[PDB]
PDB file of C-alpha atoms in Angstrom:
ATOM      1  CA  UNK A 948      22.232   5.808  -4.141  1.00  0.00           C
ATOM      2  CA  UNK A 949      19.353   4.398  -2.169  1.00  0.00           C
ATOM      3  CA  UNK A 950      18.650   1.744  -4.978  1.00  0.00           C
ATOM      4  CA  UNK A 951      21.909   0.463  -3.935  1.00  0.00           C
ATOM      5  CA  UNK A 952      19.726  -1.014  -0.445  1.00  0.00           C
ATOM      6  CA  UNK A 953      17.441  -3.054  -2.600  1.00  0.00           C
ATOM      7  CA  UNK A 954      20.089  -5.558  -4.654  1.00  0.00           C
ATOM      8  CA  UNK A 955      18.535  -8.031  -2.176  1.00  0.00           C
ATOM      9  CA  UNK A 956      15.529  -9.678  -0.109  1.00  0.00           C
ATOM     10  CA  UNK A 957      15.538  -6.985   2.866  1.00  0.00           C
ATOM     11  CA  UNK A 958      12.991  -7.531   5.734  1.00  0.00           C
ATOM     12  CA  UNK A 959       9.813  -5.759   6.253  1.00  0.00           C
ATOM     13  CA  UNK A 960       8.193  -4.225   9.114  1.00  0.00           C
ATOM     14  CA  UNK A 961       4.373  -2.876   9.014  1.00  0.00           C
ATOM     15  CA  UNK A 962       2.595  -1.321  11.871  1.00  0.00           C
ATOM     16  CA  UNK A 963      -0.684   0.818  11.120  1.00  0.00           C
ATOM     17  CA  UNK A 964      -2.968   1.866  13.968  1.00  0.00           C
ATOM     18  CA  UNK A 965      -6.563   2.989  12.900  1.00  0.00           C
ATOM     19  CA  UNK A 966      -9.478   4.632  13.730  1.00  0.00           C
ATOM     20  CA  UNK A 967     -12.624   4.076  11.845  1.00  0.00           C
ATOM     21  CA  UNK A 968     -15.647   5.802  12.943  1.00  0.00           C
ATOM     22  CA  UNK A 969     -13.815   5.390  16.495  1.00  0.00           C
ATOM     23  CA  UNK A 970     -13.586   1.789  15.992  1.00  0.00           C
ATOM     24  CA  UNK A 971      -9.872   1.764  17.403  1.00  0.00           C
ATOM     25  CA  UNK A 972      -7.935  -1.476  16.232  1.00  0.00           C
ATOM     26  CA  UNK A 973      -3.429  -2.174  15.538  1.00  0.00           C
ATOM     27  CA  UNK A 974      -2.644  -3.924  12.468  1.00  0.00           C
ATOM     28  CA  UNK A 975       1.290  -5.630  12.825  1.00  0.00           C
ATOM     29  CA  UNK A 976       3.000  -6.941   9.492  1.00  0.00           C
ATOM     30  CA  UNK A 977       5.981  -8.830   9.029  1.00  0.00           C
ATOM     31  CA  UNK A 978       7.795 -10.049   5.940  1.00  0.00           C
ATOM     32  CA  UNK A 979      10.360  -9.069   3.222  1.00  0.00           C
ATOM     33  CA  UNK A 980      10.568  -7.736  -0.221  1.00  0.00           C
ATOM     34  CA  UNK A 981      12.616  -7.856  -3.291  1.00  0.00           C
ATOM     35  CA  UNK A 982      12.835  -5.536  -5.753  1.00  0.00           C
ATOM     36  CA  UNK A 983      14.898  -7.990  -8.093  1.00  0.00           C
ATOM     37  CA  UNK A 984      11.410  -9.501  -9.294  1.00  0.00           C
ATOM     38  CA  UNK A 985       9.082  -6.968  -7.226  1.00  0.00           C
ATOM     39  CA  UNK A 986       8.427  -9.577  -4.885  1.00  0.00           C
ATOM     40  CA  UNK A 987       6.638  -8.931  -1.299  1.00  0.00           C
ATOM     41  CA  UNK A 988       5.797 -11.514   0.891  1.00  0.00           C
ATOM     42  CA  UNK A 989       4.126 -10.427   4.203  1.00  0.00           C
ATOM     43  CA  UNK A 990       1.674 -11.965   7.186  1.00  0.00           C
ATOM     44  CA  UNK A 991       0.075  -9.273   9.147  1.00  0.00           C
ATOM     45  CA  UNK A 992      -1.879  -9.844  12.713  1.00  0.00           C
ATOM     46  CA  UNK A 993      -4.765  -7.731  13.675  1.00  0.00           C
ATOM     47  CA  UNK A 994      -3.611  -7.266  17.495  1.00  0.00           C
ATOM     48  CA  UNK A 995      -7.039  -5.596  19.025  1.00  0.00           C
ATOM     49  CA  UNK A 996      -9.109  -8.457  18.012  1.00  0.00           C
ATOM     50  CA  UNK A 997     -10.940  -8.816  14.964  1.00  0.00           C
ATOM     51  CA  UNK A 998     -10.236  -6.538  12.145  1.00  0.00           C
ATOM     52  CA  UNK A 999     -13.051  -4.124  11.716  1.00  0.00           C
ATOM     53  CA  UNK A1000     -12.945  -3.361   8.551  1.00  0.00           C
ATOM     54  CA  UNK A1001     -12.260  -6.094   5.825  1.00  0.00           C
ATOM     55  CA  UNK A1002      -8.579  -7.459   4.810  1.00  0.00           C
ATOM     56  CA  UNK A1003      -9.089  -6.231   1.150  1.00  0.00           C
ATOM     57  CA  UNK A1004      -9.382  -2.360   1.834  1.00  0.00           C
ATOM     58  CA  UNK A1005      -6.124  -1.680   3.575  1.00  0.00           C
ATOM     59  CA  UNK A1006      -3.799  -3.897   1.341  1.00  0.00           C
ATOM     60  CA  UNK A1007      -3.031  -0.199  -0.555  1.00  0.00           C
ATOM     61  CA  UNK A1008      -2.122   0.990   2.542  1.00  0.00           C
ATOM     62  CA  UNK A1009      -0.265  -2.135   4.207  1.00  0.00           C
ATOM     63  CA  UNK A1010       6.163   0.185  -0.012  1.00  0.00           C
ATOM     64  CA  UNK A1011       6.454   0.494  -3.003  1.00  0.00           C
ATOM     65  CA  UNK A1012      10.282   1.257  -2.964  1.00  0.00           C
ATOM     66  CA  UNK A1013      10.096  -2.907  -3.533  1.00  0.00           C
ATOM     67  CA  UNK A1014       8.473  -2.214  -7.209  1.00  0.00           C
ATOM     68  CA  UNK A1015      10.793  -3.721 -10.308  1.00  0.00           C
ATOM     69  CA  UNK A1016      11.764  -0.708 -12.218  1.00  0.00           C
ATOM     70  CA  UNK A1017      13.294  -2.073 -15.432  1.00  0.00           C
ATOM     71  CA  UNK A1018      16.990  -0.829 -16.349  1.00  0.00           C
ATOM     72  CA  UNK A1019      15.434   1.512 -18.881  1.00  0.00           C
ATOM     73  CA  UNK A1020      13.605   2.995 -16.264  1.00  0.00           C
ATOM     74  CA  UNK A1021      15.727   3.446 -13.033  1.00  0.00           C
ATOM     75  CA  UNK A1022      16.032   7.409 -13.697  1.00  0.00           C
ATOM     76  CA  UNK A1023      12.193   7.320 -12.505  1.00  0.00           C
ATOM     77  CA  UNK A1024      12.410   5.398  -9.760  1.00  0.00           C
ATOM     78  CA  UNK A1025      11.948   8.274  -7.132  1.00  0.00           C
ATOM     79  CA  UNK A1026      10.574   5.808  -4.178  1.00  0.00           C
ATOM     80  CA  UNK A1027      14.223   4.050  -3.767  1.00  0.00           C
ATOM     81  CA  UNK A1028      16.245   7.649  -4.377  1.00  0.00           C
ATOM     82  CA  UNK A1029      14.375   8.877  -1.320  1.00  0.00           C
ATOM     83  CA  UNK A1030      15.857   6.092   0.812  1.00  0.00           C
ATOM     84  CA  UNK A1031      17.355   5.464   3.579  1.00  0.00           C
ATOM     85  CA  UNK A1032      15.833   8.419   4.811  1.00  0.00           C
ATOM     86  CA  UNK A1033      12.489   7.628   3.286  1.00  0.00           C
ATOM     87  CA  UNK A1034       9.072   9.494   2.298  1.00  0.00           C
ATOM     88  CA  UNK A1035       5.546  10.318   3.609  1.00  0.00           C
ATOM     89  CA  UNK A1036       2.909   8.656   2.032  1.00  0.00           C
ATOM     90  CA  UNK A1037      -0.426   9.982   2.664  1.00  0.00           C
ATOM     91  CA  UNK A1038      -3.639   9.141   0.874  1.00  0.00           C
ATOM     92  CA  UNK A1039      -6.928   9.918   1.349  1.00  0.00           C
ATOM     93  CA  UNK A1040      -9.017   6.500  -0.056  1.00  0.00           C
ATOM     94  CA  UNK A1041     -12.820   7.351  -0.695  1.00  0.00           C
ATOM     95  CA  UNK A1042     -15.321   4.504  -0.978  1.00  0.00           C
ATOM     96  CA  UNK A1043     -18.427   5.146  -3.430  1.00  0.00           C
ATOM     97  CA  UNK A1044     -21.002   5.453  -1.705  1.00  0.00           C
ATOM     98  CA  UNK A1045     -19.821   4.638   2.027  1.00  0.00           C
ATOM     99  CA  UNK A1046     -16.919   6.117   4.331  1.00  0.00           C
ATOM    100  CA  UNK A1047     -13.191   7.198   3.685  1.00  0.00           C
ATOM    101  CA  UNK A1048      -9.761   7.135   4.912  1.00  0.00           C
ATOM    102  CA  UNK A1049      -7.384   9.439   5.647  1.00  0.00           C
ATOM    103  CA  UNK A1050      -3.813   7.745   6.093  1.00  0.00           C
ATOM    104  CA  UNK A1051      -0.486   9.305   6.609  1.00  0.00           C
ATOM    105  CA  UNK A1052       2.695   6.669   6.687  1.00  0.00           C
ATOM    106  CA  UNK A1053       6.240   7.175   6.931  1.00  0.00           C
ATOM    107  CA  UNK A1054       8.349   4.663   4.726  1.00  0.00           C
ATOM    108  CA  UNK A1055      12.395   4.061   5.570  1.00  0.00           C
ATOM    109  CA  UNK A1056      14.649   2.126   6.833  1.00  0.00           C
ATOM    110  CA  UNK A1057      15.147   1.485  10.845  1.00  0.00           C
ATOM    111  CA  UNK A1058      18.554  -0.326  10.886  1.00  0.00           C
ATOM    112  CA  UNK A1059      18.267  -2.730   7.852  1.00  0.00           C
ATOM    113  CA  UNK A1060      14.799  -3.497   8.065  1.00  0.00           C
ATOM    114  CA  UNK A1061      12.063  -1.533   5.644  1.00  0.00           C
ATOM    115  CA  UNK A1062       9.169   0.470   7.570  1.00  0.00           C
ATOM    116  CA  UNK A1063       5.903   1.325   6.738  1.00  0.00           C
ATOM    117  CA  UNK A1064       4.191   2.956   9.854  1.00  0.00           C
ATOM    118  CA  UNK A1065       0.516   3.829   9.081  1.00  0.00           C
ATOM    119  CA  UNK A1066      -1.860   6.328  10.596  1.00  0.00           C
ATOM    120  CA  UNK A1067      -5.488   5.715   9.734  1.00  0.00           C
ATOM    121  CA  UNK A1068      -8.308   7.778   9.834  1.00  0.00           C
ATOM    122  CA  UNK A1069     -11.858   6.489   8.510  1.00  0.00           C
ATOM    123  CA  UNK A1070     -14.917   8.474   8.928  1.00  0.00           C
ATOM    124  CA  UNK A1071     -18.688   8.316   7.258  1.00  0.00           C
ATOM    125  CA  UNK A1072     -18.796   4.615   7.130  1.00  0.00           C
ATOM    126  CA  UNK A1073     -22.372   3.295   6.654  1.00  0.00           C
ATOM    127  CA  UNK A1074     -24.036   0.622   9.107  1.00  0.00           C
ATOM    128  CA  UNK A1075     -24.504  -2.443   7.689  1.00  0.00           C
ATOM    129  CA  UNK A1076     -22.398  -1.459   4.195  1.00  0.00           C
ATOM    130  CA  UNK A1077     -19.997  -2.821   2.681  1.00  0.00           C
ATOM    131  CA  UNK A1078     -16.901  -1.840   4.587  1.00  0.00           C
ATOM    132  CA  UNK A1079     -18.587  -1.829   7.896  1.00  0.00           C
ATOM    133  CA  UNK A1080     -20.281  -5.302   7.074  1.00  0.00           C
ATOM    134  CA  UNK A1081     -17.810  -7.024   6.236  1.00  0.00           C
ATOM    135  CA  UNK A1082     -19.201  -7.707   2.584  1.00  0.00           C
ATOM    136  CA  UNK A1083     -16.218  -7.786   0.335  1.00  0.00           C
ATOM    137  CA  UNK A1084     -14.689 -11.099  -1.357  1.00  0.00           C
ATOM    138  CA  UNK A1085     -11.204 -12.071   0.328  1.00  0.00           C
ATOM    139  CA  UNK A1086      -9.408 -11.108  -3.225  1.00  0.00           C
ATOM    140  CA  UNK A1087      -7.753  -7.944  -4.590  1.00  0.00           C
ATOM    141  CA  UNK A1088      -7.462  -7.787  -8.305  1.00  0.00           C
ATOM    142  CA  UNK A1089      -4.550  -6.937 -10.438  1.00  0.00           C
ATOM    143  CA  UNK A1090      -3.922  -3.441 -11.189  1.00  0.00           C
ATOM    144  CA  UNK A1091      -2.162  -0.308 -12.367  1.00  0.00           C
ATOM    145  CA  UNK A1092      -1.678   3.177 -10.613  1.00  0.00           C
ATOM    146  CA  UNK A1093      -0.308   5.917 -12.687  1.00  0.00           C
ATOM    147  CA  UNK A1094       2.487   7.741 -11.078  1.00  0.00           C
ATOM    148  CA  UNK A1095       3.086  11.622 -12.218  1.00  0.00           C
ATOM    149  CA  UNK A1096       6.159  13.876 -10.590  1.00  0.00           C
ATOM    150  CA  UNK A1097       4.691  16.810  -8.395  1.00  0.00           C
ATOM    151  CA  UNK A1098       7.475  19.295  -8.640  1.00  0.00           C
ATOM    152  CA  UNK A1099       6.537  22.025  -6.599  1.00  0.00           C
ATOM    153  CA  UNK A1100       6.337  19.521  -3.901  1.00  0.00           C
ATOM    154  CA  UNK A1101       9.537  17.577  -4.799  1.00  0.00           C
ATOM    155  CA  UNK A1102       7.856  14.314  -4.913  1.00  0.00           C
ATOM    156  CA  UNK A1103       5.322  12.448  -6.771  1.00  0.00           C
ATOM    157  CA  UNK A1104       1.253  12.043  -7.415  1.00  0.00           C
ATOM    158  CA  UNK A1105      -0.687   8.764  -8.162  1.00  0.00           C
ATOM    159  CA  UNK A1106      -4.780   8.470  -8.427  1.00  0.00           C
ATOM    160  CA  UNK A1107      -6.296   5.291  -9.030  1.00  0.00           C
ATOM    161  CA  UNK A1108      -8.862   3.395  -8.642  1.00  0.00           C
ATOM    162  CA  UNK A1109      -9.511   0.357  -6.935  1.00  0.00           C
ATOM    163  CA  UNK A1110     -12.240  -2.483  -8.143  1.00  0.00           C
ATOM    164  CA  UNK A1111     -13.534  -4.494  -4.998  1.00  0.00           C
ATOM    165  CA  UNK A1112     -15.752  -7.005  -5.856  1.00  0.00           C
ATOM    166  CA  UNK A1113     -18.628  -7.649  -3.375  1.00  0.00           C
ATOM    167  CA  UNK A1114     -20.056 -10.649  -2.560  1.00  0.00           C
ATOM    168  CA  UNK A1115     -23.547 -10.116  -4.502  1.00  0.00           C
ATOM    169  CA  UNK A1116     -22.046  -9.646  -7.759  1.00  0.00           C
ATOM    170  CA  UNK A1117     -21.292  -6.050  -7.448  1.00  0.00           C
ATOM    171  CA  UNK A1118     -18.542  -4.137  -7.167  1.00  0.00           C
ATOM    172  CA  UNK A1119     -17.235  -1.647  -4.211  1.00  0.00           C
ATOM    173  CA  UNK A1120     -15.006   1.291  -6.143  1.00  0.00           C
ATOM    174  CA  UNK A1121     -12.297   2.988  -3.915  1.00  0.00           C
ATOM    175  CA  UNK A1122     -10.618   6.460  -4.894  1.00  0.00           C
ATOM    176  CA  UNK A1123      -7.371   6.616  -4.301  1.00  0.00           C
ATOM    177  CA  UNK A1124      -5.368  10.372  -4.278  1.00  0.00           C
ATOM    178  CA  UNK A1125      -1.818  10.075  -3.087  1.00  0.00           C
ATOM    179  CA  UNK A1126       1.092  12.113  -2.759  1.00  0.00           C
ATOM    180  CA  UNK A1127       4.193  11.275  -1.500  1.00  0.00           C
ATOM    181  CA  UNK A1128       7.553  13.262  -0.478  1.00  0.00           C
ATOM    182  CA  UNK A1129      11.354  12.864   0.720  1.00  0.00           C
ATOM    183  CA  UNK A1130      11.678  12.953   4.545  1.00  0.00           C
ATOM    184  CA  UNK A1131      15.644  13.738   4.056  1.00  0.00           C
ATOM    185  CA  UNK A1132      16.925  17.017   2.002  1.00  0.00           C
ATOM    186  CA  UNK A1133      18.933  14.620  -0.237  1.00  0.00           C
ATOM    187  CA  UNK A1134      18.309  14.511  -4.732  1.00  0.00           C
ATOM    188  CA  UNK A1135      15.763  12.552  -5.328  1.00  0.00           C
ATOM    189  CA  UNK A1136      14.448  11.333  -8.776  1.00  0.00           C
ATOM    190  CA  UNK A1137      11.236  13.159 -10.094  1.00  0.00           C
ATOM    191  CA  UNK A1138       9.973  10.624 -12.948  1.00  0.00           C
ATOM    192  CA  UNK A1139       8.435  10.819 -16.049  1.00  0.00           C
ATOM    193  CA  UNK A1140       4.954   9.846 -15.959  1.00  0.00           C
ATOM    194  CA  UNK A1141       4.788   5.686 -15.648  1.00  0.00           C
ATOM    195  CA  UNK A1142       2.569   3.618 -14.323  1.00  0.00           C
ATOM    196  CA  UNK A1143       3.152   0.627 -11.378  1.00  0.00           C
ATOM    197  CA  UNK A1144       1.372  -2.918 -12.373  1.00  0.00           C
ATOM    198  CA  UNK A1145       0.287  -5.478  -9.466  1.00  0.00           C
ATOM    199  CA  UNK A1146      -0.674  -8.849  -8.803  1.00  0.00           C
ATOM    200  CA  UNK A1147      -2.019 -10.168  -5.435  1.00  0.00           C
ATOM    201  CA  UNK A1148      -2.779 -13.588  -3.887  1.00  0.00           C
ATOM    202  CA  UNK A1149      -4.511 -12.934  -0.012  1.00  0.00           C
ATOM    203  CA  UNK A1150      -4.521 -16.770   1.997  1.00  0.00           C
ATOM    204  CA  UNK A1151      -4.936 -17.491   5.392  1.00  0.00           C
ATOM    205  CA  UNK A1152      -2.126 -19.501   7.430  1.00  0.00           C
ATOM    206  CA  UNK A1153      -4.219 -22.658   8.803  1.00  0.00           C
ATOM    207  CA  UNK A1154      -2.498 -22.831  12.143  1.00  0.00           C
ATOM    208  CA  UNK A1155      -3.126 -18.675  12.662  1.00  0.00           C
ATOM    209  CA  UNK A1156      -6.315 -18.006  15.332  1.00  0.00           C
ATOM    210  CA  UNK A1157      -5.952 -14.431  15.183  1.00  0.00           C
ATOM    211  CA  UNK A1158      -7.293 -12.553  12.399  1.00  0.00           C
ATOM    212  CA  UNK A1159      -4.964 -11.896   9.925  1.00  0.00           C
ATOM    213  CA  UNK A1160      -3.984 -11.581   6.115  1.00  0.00           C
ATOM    214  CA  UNK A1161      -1.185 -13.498   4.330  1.00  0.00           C
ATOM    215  CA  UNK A1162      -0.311 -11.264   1.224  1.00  0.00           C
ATOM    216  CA  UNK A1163       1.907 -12.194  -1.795  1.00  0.00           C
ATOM    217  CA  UNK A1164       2.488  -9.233  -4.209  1.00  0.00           C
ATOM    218  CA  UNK A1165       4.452  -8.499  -7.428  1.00  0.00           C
ATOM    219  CA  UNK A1166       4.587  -4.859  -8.306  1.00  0.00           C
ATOM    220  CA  UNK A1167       6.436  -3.912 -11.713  1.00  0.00           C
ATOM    221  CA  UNK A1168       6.891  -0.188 -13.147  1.00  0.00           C
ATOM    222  CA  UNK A1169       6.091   0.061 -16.514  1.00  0.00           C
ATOM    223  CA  UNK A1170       4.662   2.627 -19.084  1.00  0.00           C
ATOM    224  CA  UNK A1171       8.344   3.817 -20.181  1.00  0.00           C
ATOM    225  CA  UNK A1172       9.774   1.571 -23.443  1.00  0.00           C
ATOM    226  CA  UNK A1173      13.221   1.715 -25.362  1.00  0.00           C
TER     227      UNK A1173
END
C-alpha cells in the first residue's frame, strides 16, 4: 500500500510557478516530511525576486499525504492510498474582499523524493490591499480543514477557511474549496468524514538574502474516535 512509503522522513520537493494579475514569479521548496508525528520541515526560495504576494497566503498551497492519521483511522487516509502515483490537488482560494487563486498541483513521488508541483493563477487583486500590499503578519494560525469523500469523483472534498491576521488589527479571511483525485487507476481509500488539525511556525534563515519562507508544520487527522 502507498502508506507503506511514509514509515520514514522522505524528502520533499516544491516548485509552484504563479501568475497574479500577470505578476509572473517561481517559488522552489526543499525539505522533508514525516508522517510518524506529521512533521514537515521545508525552506522555500522565491527565484524571480521578491515574492509578490505575501509568505502567509500560499503556505495552503506550498502534501498532505505527510498528515498523522492515527491507527484507528488509517482506513481514511485516502492521500497516502493514492501514492506513488499520486493526486491532483486543485483549489480555488478566494480572499474577502480582494483577488483569488486558482491552483492546480500534482502530488507523487519522482524517484524517492515527494512532489508538489503548483500552478497558480490569481486574478482581481486590489492595489494597495492586503495581498497586493504586502499587509499581512508573517504568522499562520493553527487550524482544521474538514475532509468529506467525493464519490462520484473517486476522491475527496475539503472547504475551509483561513484566518489571516492583518497588521491593523483586522483580519484577511481566505475561502478555500478543494478537491482532490488519484492520478493512477489503482483502490484508493474514500474516508469517512474527518477533519486534518495544523500547527505552523514561519522564520527566516539569518544568512538567506533572497526572499524566502522557513516553514515548520504538524498536521494530525482527527475527528474519528474508538
Amino acid at each position: 500500500k502507498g502508506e507503506e512509503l511514509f514509515t520514514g522522513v522522505v524528502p520533499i520537493l516544491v516548485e509552484l510557478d504563479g501568475d497574479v494579475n500577470g505578476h509572473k514569479f517561481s517559488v522552489r521548496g526543499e525539505g522533508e516530511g514525516d508522517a510518524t508525528n506529521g512533521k514537515l520541515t521545508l525552506k522555500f526560495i522565491c527565484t524571480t525576486g521578491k515574492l509578490p504576494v505575501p509568505w502567509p497566503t500560499l503556505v495552503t498551497t506550498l502534501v498532505l499525504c505527510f498528515a498523522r492519521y492515527p491507527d484507528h483511522m488509517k482506513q481514511h487516509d485516502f492521500f497516502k492510498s493514492a501514492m506513488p502515483e499520486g493526486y491532483v490537488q486543485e483549489r480555488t482560494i478566494s480572499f474577502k474582499d480582494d483577488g483569488y487563486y486558482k491552483t492546480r498541483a500534482e502530488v507523487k513521488f519522482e524517484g524517492d523524493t515527494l512532489v508538489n508541483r503548483i500552478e497558480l493563477k490569481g486574478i482581481d487583486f486590489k492595489e494597495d490591499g492586503n495581498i497586493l500590499g504586502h499587509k499581512l503578519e508573517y504568522n499562520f494560525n493553527s487550524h482544521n480543514a474538514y475532509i468529506t469523500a467525493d464519490k462520484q469523483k473517486n476522491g475527496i472534498k475539503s472547504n475551509f477557511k483561513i484566518r489571516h491576521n492583518v497588521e491593523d488589527g483586522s483580519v484577511q479571511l481566505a475561502d478555500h474549496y478543494q478537491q482532490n483525485t488519484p492520478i493512477g487507476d489503482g483502490p484508493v481509500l474514500l474516508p469517512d468524514n474527518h477533519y486534518l488539525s495544523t500547527q505552523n511556525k514561519l522564520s527566516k534563515d539569518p544568512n538567506e538574502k533572497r526572499d524566502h519562507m522557513v516553514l515548520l508544520e504538524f498536521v494530525t487527522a482527527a475527528g474519528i474516535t474508538l
